Amino acid sequence: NSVRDAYIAQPHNCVYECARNEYCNDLCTKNGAKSGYCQWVGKYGNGCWCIELPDNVPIRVPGKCH
Numbered sequence: 001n002s003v004r005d006a007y008i009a010q011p012h013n014c015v016y017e018c019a020r021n022e023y024c025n026d027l028c029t030k031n032g033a034k035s036g037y038c039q040w041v042g043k044y045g046n047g048c049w050c051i052e053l054p055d056n057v058p059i060r061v062p063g064k065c066h
Contacts, residue, residue: 003052006059007044008036013058014065015047024048031057 018038028036028050036050
């Protein structure tokens with residue numbers, strides 16, 4: 001779809017680690033998301049999770065972070 005909830009990604013297919021929830025909310029919203037938070041446990045471990053991220057922004061997908 002046009003929006004999805006997921007780990008925002010940086011080059012190349014890598015999550016953004018986090019220490020604070022606010023860091024993720026800022027990172028996510030700055031990229032068009034509704035909000036975001038720091039996931040200390042989840043599918044790929046520690047990383048920022050965004051709610052309703054636009055699809056022109058990369059998300060973590062199956063594969064290797066490189």
